[PDB]
Amino acid sequence: MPHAFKPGDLVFAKMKGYPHWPARIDDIADGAVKPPPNKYPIFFFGTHETAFLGPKDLFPYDKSKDKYGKPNKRKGFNEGLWEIQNNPHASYS
């Protein structure tokens, strides 16, 4: 069965103004800013930016890649597709 999101989970994450975007659930460093209730730190592949999003905007990757995994013209998107496929757990900092 599915569980609550945890660090390392791979998703497509939806933000306003962007296509559903390859991403992963990150962990929260000690003393770093914590998310709002029921939100998670989402690291976006390709752009390497992080935002706080809730589960309504998070689509498990395996289930959703046929729909959301096609290349596009957005800055960083195709690199993000490559990173989630080839080295999703790497350090990109």
- What would be the CATH architecture of the domain defined by 12-29+37-86? Roll (2.30)
Domain residue ranges of the chain, discontinuous segments joined by +: 12-29+37-86
Question: Collapsing DSSP states into helix, strand and coil, what is residue 22?
Answer: strand
Determine contact, residues 13/58, Cβ cutoff 8 Å.
Answer: yes
> Residue 37 and residue 39: Cα distance in Å, rounded?
6
Region of 66 on the Ramachandran plot (φ > 0 left; ψ -120 to 50 alpha; else beta): alpha
- What are the backbone angles phi and psi of residue 52, rounded to the nearest 5°? -95, 125
The experimental method is: X-ray
Determine contact, residues 50/43, Cβ cutoff 8 Å.
Answer: yes
